[PDB]
Every structure is written in structure tokens, then in C-alpha cells.
Amino acid sequence: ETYDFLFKFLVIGNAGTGKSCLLHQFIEKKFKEFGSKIINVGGKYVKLQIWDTAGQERFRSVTRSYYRGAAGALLVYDITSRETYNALTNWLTDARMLASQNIVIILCGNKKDLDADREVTFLEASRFAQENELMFLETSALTGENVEEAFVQCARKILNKIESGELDPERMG
Ligand SMILES: Nc1nc2c(ncn2[C@@H]2O[C@H](COP(=O)(O)OP(=O)(O)O)[C@@H](O)[C@H]2O)c(=O)[nH]1
């Protein structure tokens, strides 16, 4: 009720990486495109308005009108598909070009439950994240692991940047 901020989030990344299932897990706490949820972050209630690009990756969603105004984005790859990890630089560039240069991004390496099929290590991706000014978590939309955490860390960093005067909360974000 007493929600104090409203942030537009994107969920972006290659087709097949689990973007739809991540949102269903976050909102409904089940495995299984728009969603909204209010979370409490350090005593502030934040409404998230989540634009999930599932099924619209090959080009429909990759536009100024869709990205515009997003304060945060979950950039999703699949730990079992190296190509989806190689595509991150493309998606990072998209997000910065089409939303803004200061969009807050969290890298999500999804399907961590598929340990036997892993093609991208945690350590390599963590190093990449550190190099590209990115938060990073591995997630499983299947089990729920780190799903809530991904949205919450993204929201917390946005609030931190509002506090630091790096982000204008009435601007894009
Ligand atoms: N085992 C496992 N499978 C997943 C996970 N997330 C998504 N999937 C599967 O990956 C495929 C694509 O997921 P989906 O959410 O439709 O991908 P999208 O195209 O990015 O929306 C489907 O077969 C899902 O069942 C996960 O965390 N673990």
C-alpha cells in the first residue's frame, strides 16, 4: 500500500534461457509477458513493473519504446548454453543504448540446477560481471534459487544510486 517507488524492469537475453519461467517463479513461486510485485527493500516498499521479453527477442521487444524508462534489467543467460553467455555483450549494449547508459543491470546465470550440463563456470561469469560493472547471481527458475534475490539486489542498487545522486528517480532511471 505505502509503496514509495515504482521501477520499470526489463528481463532480457536470448530465447530459451528461462526469462518467462524466472518471472513466473518470482511472482507465483512456481515454475510453469508482464508482471508486477511490491517488495520491501530496507524499509521502503518498491513496486516493480516487469517487462519480460520472452518470445519477443528476435526483434519485437528490442526497441527504444520497449526499453525506454527502465531503471533496472535482469540480463539472463543459460549456464548450459555457451552461446547465450557469449551474447551478453550484445544485450548489454542494447540495454545501454535503448534504455540509458546508467541502467542498473544484474547478470543472471540461469538453470544452475543443470550442473551436469554446465558450459559456463560461475568463476568466469563472476569475473566478467566484475569487469562490466554488473551484479551477478546464478539462478534457477526451476527451484527458485536466487530468483527473488535477483530482483531485490537490482532494486537495492537502484535505491543506492538514487541515494548517491547518480540516478534521477523522476528521470528514465
Ligand atoms: N532445469 C531448468 N530448466 C529451466 C529453467 N528455466 C527455464 N527452464 C527451461 O528452459 C526452457 C526455456 O524457458 P523459458 O522460460 O520459456 O525461456 P524464454 O524463451 O527465455 O522465456 C524451457 O524448457 C524451460 O522449462 C531452470 O532454471 N532450470
* Domain harbouring 21, CATH code: 3.40.50.300
Nearest CA to ligand 1 atom 15: 18
> Could you tell me how far CA 75 lies from the centroid of its own chain?
5
Rounded to 5 degrees, φ, ψ at 113 are -65, -25
- Residue whose C-alpha is closest to residue 50's, from 64, 63, 39: 39
Q: How far apart are CA 173 and CA 170, in angstroms?
A: 7
* Domain limits for position 129: 4-173
Q: Which long-range contacts (CB under 8 A, 24 or more apart) does 52-55 make?
A: 52/10, 52/11, 52/19, 52/20, 52/22, 52/23, 53/10, 53/11, 53/12, 53/13, 53/19, 54/11, 54/19, 54/20, 54/23, 55/15, 55/20
Does residue 114 have a known ligand-binding role?
A: no
Q: Beta strand 5-13 with 44-52: parallel, antiparallel or unpaired?
A: parallel
Distance CA 92, CA 113 (A): 25
21 lines ligand 1 (CB under 6 A): yes
Give the chain's end-to-end CA distance (angstroms, integer).
22
- Taking the centre of ligand 1 as the mean of its atom positions, its distance from the CA of residue 172, in whole angstroms, is 30
The strand pair at 5-13 and 104-110 is best described as: unpaired
Domains of the chain: total = 1
Q: Looking at the CA of residue 32, tell me the nearest atom of ligand 1.
A: 25
Longest dimension (CA), the chain: 45
CA dist., res. 47 & res. 1, Å (int): 10
Ligand-binding site membership of 159 (annotated):
no
Cβ of 17 closer than 6 Å to ligand 1, yes or no, is yes
By what technique were these coordinates determined?
A: X-ray
Q: What Cα–Cα distance (Å) separates residue 40 from each residue in 13, 43, 54, 146? A: 26, 6, 26, 16
Ligand 1 and 141: CB distance under 6 A? yes
